[PDB]
Amino acid sequence: KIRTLQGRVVSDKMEKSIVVAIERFVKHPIYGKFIKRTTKLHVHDENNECGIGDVVEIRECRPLSKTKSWTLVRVVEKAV
Amino acid sequence: ATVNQLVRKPRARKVAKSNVPALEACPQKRGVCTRVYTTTPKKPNSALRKVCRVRLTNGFEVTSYIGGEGHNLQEHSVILIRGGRVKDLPGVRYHTVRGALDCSGVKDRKQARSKYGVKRPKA
Amino acid sequence: ARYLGPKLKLSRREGTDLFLKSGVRAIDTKCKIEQAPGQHGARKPRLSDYGVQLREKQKVRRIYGVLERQFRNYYKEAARLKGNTGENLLALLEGRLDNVVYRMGFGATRAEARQLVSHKAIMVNGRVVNIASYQVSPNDVVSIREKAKKQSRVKAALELAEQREKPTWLEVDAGKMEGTFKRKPERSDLSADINEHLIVELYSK
Amino acid sequence: ELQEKLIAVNRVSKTVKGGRIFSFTALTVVGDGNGRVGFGYGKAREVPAAIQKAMEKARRNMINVALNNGTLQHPVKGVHTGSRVFMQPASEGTGIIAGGAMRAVLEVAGVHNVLAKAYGSTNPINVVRATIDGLENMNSPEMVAAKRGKSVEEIL
Amino acid sequence: SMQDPIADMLTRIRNGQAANKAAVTMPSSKLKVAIANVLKEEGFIEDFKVEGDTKPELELTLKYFQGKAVVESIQRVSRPGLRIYKRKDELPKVMAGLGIAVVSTSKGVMTDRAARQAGLGGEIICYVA
Amino acid sequence: MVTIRLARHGAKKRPFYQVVVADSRNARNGRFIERVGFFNPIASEKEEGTRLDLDRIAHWVGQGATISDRVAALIKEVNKAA
RNA sequence: UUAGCUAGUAGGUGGGGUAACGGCUCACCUAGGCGACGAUCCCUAGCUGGUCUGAGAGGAUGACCAGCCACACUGGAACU
RNA sequence: UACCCGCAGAAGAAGCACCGGCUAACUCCGUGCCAGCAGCCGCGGUAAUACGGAGGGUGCAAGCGUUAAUCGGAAUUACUGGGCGUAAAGCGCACGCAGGCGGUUUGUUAAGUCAGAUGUGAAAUCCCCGGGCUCAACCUGGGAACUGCAUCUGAUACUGG
Ligand SMILES: [Mg+2]
Ligand SMILES: [Mg+2]
Ligand SMILES: [Mg+2]
Ligand SMILES: [Mg+2]
Ligand SMILES: [Mg+2]
Ligand SMILES: [Mg+2]
Ligand SMILES: [Mg+2]
Ligand SMILES: [Mg+2]
Ligand SMILES: [Mg+2]
Ligand SMILES: [Mg+2]
Ligand SMILES: [Mg+2]
Ligand SMILES: [Mg+2]
Ligand SMILES: [Mg+2]
Ligand SMILES: [Mg+2]
Ligand SMILES: [Mg+2]
Ligand SMILES: [Mg+2]
Ligand SMILES: [Mg+2]
Ligand SMILES: [Mg+2]
Ligand SMILES: [Mg+2]
Ligand SMILES: [Mg+2]
Ligand SMILES: [Mg+2]
Ligand SMILES: [Mg+2]
Ligand SMILES: [Mg+2]
Ligand SMILES: [Mg+2]
Ligand SMILES: [Mg+2]
Ligand SMILES: [Mg+2]
Ligand SMILES: [Mg+2]
Ligand SMILES: [Mg+2]
Ligand SMILES: [Mg+2]
């Protein structure tokens, strides 16, 4: 109903902000091979609730910062 | 040749250089004659090829063959080279346009007459 | 933009008749139709594979009198249109106005048929048409107009049309000096010595 | 009734104590305007003698080709020793679109509508072997129906 | 390693035909039965049979017509190193329609001709010609 | 403001006008919003030389688009022929 | 035969600021951020619809027409 | 102005390249490794179809050649569509992280994939069927196409989870 994406959390060291690797799976435009392509996004989280290696689900919002325009909605597979 | 290898390192082509670099992708360039002289050719041939060392307009110093029989070419003469090499001369890559800005047409030539800048002989 | 030289010289090079003269006098009398023109005309050299493809295309051009740039455009149109490319190439040549004037026998030769077109003597569906390469759609009438109806060479040309074979796809009225291009001709309607496949292979290098 | 085309003549040599001995080779192919195609390769001291030996061997060892109406039946490939060869069934009246030695062998084969391309070495002896090898294993809609044990209509 | 079982199936058919073997056996699979289902139905092999409980062995009974082999050519198209998916408009015609292309679709594994009549495409397993 | 006007698209000496909807600050033959028909002033007998999608034209005028002086003649001529 | 780059830099809080979000600006706090899926640096370059070629896939290209962008002696700045 | 009508008389209107092989089209005379030609192979040293003129011919045509430039032929950077014993080409050998890939069975997921629908993919251009300029170039109506992306609804064989 609303557009959202998923991915691993790469780092969480800066407060109220995490960086999330969304790994899309595209075809090569020439050779036809399917290549994993990784997209890093800076995501605003309230309360610093995510960790490294965490899978997260994010949505797009108004720009919070210079490099940050994304906010998570919920967390799946929190633990190690 | 493996499809993973071409993703990581694609098929790079061969940037082919031009064998007439002084023209600089122009059809003809105006030059000034520095030295008009003759040259003996490679080993299967034997002649005295009339060929001139030319300072061009863009700044390059190339030598240029003078086609046809006879030429009124001197030093400090303003000619127009066009590109196209003489095989049997080492290093000559250009042809002078006969009939351009100082060079005269070939005297009394009646076949392939436009390749040497000679008017139609009216009866 | 027309060939103006000797006409049997073209027929001597091709080796056969191209119907470039009216056929009043027999063609073997006016020229050596079995000998190519020039000093070295008696010799028949071993003609190459590119030679027989050129001589076939130079045969068909010199019949209709079409230069190469315009004849190239008929190949582009015939390859574009559906069906057999070579048959469409002949169907476009048979659609020319100066051919229709010749096939109805209003001019004795195709050049004379061209000049009647070129000198504003032909009306197509009532309207005068000045272009030799005008395409003539089916179910169209095409007539000698009023002023040139009293020409000597027109009704003399209808005389020579009776010696020639009557084409099926037309319907001429020699009294009114008009006709009707009823349909486009079939490949079987035309000559059978023309190897149209040699021309198609030539423009497909 | 068997139309005969020579493809290429060639002068070869053979060095002996006296010097060079020259000889001539001739590559000819025959065909009936239908599936019977056959090529020949003769060699003698003289050019009219060499074509006659080539025409003699070409008239036997014919091979049969299941043609379509005037074209091939499916895009088939043929190789021999330098010459991978592609040829393709084509629409009506497009002509023989083929190169050099391949033009002569398909013309006496009785096809009239091909789209061809000769890759690799275009040596006329091996490329005329590559088309004959290419045309021989081309199979009909009848041949695949009897082989697979179905009707022609179940194959479409 | 056994990177691809399906290309092992096709190669054992191809080497089986060229060696004039009567039957060819191999370890069975859920996908290998569906391919042998098409090859028996389309007429390239005589019969298939899966035997055994712990490790099932798929046995293919080959088919020979007039001495020479029925399966003239058999090739793998989509492979684990490079997958091939086609839409229903871009399904191939093997040997101008004489051969078949075994295509894996959402409604099971079928031939390319039945894939067009079903109106949906998928992954091209192999060309059999 | 948004307007409805002609646009010269023809050969030399033989004009042909696309009647388009455009922001009036754009160029004549340049950027436009919606093509709502055409007009042919060298229109022969037995062909249409004027066809205007009047449902779209009445849609943009309801939005407040203005009409050119020549277009308002052509909206009249459609409503007199039809 | 460019491997490291970045201190308003990365983020937070609050203030200011804009038509509007925002390091956009400022104070403070945190130590981040980017990078081998090529950061940074260097050379070249207006981009596209398209055009040319080619059977196709591709290659080459961006004159005319049209869309967007940039610039108006050079370097700057703001006013209305 | 287009357009149309009248006048007069074949008048006022053909050139350029090329002709050894590739490559369509040949002879003669000058010339003697000179003068010169030339894209490649190569021609010229006294009988030159290769140089220059002539005759003849061939290709084009109000143009024709030359040069520059791009793709093609070139499957000669090969995705389609190549190779690596000896022709250019397997690292001296091995372990191994990232990466690529992965036996078999069931369930589940729907990411890939597949299907449908919607939105969008400006117009022109290209293509198709027509229409209009005496034809064509050109102009133009309708359509297809824009092979893409997004969202939604499914499908579950295959691949992934
Ligand atoms: Mg010449
Ligand atoms: Mg010359
Ligand atoms: Mg012209
Ligand atoms: Mg056609
Ligand atoms: Mg080779
Ligand atoms: Mg009026
Ligand atoms: Mg703030
Ligand atoms: Mg610039
Ligand atoms: Mg190609
Ligand atoms: Mg200035
Ligand atoms: Mg300024
Ligand atoms: Mg010749
Ligand atoms: Mg001598
Ligand atoms: Mg002599
Ligand atoms: Mg020559
Ligand atoms: Mg090339
Ligand atoms: Mg290529
Ligand atoms: Mg190789
Ligand atoms: Mg060696
Ligand atoms: Mg080696
Ligand atoms: Mg080794
Ligand atoms: Mg190593
Ligand atoms: Mg598996
Ligand atoms: Mg699954
Ligand atoms: Mg999915
Ligand atoms: Mg879909
Ligand atoms: Mg018309
Ligand atoms: Mg468009
Ligand atoms: Mg699974």
UniProtKB/Swiss-Prot annotation, chain F:
Question: Which GO MF term does the entry hold, naming one?
Answer: structural constituent of ribosome
> PROSITE patterns annotated for this entry?
RIBOSOMAL_S16
The alphabetized UniProt keywords are: Ribonucleoprotein, Ribosomal protein
Gene3D superfamilies the record matches: 3.30.1320.10
Which Pfam families does the record associate with it? Ribosomal_S16 (PF00886)
Q: What GO terms describe the biological role, i.e. biological process, of this protein?
A: translation
Q: Identify one Gene Ontology CC term for this UniProt entry.
A: small ribosomal subunit
The text of the family note is:
Belongs to the bacterial ribosomal protein bS16 family.
Alphabetized HAMAP family for the sequence: Ribosomal_bS16 (MF_00385)
> What is the name of this protein?
Small ribosomal subunit protein bS16
- Which gene holds the coding sequence for this protein? rpsP
